[PDB]
Amino acid sequence: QANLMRLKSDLFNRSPMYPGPTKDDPLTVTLGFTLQDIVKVDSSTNEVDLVYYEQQRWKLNSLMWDPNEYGNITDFRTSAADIWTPDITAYSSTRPVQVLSPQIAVVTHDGSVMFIPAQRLSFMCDPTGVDSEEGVTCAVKFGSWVYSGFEIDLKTDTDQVDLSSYYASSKYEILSATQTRQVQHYSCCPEPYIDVNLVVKFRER
Amino acid sequence: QANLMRLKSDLFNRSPMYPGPTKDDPLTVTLGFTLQDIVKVDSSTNEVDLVYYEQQRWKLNSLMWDPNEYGNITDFRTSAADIWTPDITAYSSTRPVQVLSPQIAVVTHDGSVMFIPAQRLSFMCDPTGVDSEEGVTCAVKFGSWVYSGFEIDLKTDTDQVDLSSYYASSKYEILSATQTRQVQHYSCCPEPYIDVNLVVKFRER
Amino acid sequence: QANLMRLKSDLFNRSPMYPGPTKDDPLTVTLGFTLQDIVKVDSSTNEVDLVYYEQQRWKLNSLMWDPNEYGNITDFRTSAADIWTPDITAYSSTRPVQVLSPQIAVVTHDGSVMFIPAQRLSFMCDPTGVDSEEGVTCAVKFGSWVYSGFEIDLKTDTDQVDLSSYYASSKYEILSATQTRQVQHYSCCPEPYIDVNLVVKFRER
Amino acid sequence: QANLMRLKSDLFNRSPMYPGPTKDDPLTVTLGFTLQDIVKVDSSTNEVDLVYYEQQRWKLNSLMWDPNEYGNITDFRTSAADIWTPDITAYSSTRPVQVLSPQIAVVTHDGSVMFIPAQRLSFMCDPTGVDSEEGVTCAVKFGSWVYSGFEIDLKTDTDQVDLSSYYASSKYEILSATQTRQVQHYSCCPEPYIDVNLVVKFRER
Amino acid sequence: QANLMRLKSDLFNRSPMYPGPTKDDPLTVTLGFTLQDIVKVDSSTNEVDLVYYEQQRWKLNSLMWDPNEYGNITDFRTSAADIWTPDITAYSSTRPVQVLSPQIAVVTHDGSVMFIPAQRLSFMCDPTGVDSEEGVTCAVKFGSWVYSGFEIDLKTDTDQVDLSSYYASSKYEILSATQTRQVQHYSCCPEPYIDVNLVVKFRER
Numbered sequence A, B, C, D, E: 001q002a003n004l005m006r007l008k009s010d011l012f013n014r015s016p017m018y019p020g021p022t023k024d025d026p027l028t029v030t031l032g033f034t035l036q037d038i039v040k041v042d043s044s045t046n047e048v049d050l051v052y053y054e055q056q057r058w059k060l061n062s063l064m065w066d067p068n069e070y071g072n073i074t075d076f077r078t079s080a081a082d083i084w085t086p087d088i089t090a091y092s093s094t095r096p097v098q099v100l101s102p103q104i105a106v107v108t109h110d111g112s113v114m115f116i117p118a119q120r121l122s123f124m125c126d127p128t129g130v131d132s133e134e135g136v137t138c139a140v141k142f143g144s145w146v147y148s149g150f151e152i153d154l155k156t157d158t159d160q161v162d163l164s165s166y167y168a169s170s171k172y173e174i175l176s177a178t179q180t181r182q183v184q185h186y187s188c189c190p191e192p193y194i195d196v197n198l199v200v201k202f203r204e205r
């Protein structure tokens, strides 16, 4: 406990918190989705409710340490409030996202951070054809709300959504689930915009 | 990181926070709406739910800096809690507004602030005739709750609501969406009152 | 900005906050209601939902200042959290009251405070007869939760509820709306209890 | 104001807050209920919703003062957050309790505290027979969550629930409402467990 | 009070809070469930709502004291916010868990902590066959969100869920309720992961 108390004190009480990335010091954020369930489909409002884990990874030099100086500690768990976290948001939500898991991150000695919030999301989705064999496709983009591709570079490790934890007795069957990194440019702005498009093809089980 | 940490420290930890505008030092707030969806229409209570982005822009001398003194930083992102924000509100909401995005603003070296909260709004709207070709018109005024025209001047860049992000498979089709700055004079009071009237004409797709 | 920053610092950072009134130093609170809408009526639970502005006015010697000493500032806007506010409550609510507006007050150099929260209230009301020409009458009392008339004296400027902002396409038509100051004494206790009785007669439009 | 500011400073800023009772220094908490309304009955989930005032009284030596030393102040009102409050809870609630009133307590010079929160409670109750003349009986136990009878001596003043404020046009009529205290010892443990069983017999009006 | 004030000050104001367990200093957390009611079953979304008490026990050397040095105090009650608590979560919830009880723990002089939060949980469960004699089986895993078996060792005192407080007039009858410790391994990671699988077999009463 003494070595970990010392490490946390040196990392969090000595210097001000990381102020976020800039064009000169960009940050790469890796996103991955683990879809657990399609909990609700509302055909009268065109809202669909998903339960998923959103894996977020990034690396900060300010979070690095030599394990030899701290009783061979290679990683620790800490409240996500103690650290800077990226402002990754769903771009077409209809309700505030509901957090289903403790807000705790894992920090590794190389400065790597892994934060996996479990969430319930209501987003814009026309479910017409969900009761058919072909099913229905719905998509929701995720990205930084305030940082462009010049400050936050969004990435995925795979374009395949993790369906290994998908509820087997769900009302809905997943035909396909992909997470695709997209780089967009708008007429307004010279900076690129990055999002991860979560595309889910599903039908009634 | 060091230059941004220094900038934020100089802007936020040296002087007290901006106390808001006065008649002697008025502030101009530019409002713009990006309508995403008409998520719900309730004909039994006369409530309509909107999902939109509300772009807010203002400029403070106290937020200015010389980029040359701070490693050529021309702008940064910071929690909206670190800065003063205008008390812009819907004058005919029926439920507290639901924030759908991170509460983060972009501050530019010229003292400009851009704050774009995504919101879900429930407001007073009689949807009689939504199921017709003519559709229905509904309006909601936005403005400062406590500041008159003498302290906060409200403006728009365009009278046209941005409909380029409007949900393509929405239950409702937008016939027209305008955002108009209105000035109101009362016999009682010498001070003018300013609002932005969001007028949306819509029908069932 | 500098003069207002100085004023706020002198009023709020020099002395402890106003500890509320006492029998020796009573406070008069003026109440006024502006009814915007009867949003929902529930005949299965006997609950009615109102949307209104509740104007609250009081005066504190501790909030007084000479405008000449502060660059001729005669009033300012401040977060209601910076000041003491009366504990005015609805005595027959069925749900926690929902705040629809920014929590900001206007302080005048004579020590006057004006606080106008917009609220959504669910209260006990049998709506039987709302669908008739005669309509239905419903009442809700407002007053201090913990202070008697010896500490907080409630007053009204008028017995007429402001209906000039009442939603013209509401499901309900207002036949009459009054706000009356009422006094009561209990056998135990000598102190009077004050409430403002909001009586609304309404029917379906 | 000055004398009350001085009193509050002496009571709350000089010594640490009361750490709660112990076996060596037990505390008597007097509990009583004022039933306002049976708002809802749900026969599909077996949940009943009550609106009531829960009167809590206790006395602390650390909250005592000589009125002569403080401008003859015999009592004051303060935020329930400034003082220790007992952890009295419903043992069979189905939803978090909703607070309908300001969280303010009355402290008397003898160290007496009176705290009367208004609340909405959903609790386990089978309402089968509510639509009959006989009605239905439902019960909810209240007590300390973590303190035994050795630390918190939970008491009542009367076994009769105050029905003098019960909503006259409620959907439900009260046939009887009692608050019976119970002291129990289990074979495991030497300490008594105390609870108050709020028993309400009611039917449709 | 003085001895307890002194004890709390020595335990909580002298050293930094316990930073959580590590591989070198693991922690055993014992979990136990007391099922109170199956409040709701939703066959359209496949969600079931449970009301239960979750007993959590763990032991910290940093929470030890000699009762002889503190007026023979052998245990005390304190806000769960004053101490470190394990991040035990339901792995298949569909809504944020609702806390129904005060967040207070019991600390014993041997460093033992007992924390029993009452909760309402919505979780993934297909209730098809609940209206039959055979009933339906539903399961929910609980475990640490961020810690492995190397840091938090989860244990049970019994595999039998406590049904002695189960609501007698519930819509649902419990056929069986077990809580089983399970050790899992993931392809990513060499460390074992522990969960407690709450398996409830139930039917309509």
Ligand SMILES: c1ccc(C2CCN(CCc3cc4ccccc4[nH]3)CC2)cc1
Residues within 6 Å of the ligand: A053, A055, A116, E143, E144, E145, E146, E186, E188, E189, E193
């Ligand atoms: C966040 C944290 C834990 C989980 C777990 C899922 C399965 N195990 C743990 C299995 C587990 C996943 C996992 C994902 C990335 C890296 C390491 C990981 N270990 C218990 C909780 C889910 C989301």
Ligand SMILES: c1ccc(C2CCN(CCc3cc4ccccc4[nH]3)CC2)cc1
Residues within 6 Å of the ligand: A091, A143, A144, A145, A146, A186, A188, A193, B034, B053, B116
């Ligand atoms: C309001 C409007 C769009 C957004 C974005 C939605 C898609 N992108 C990039 C699209 C985008 C245009 C744009 C115009 C002005 C300022 C920021 C902007 N971001 C990232 C955030 C956030 C808030």
Ligand SMILES: c1ccc(C2CCN(CCc3cc4ccccc4[nH]3)CC2)cc1
Residues within 6 Å of the ligand: B091, B143, B144, B145, B146, B186, B188, B189, B193, C053, C116
């Ligand atoms: C609380 C509740 C509602 C408001 C206003 C409602 C409509 N207007 C301006 C309408 C308005 C005239 C007027 C005349 C004298 C004093 C205050 C006044 N407000 C802007 C906001 C402000 C604060």
Ligand SMILES: c1ccc(C2CCN(CCc3cc4ccccc4[nH]3)CC2)cc1
Residues within 6 Å of the ligand: C091, C143, C144, C145, C146, C186, C188, C189, C193, D053, D116
């Ligand atoms: C708890 C319970 C009710 C209230 C009130 C609701 C109606 N009154 C009546 C207030 C009131 C009666 C009374 C009778 C005997 C002794 C003290 C009393 N206070 C003012 C506030 C406030 C706090």
Ligand SMILES: c1ccc(C2CCN(CCc3cc4ccccc4[nH]3)CC2)cc1
Residues within 6 Å of the ligand: D091, D143, D144, D145, D146, D186, D188, D189, D193, E053, E116
């Ligand atoms: C967590 C879970 C339940 C409770 C209680 C439920 C019922 N009682 C009596 C609680 C109670 C019996 C009992 C019997 C033997 C040993 C210890 C015991 N505690 C008071 C609160 C408190 C905290």
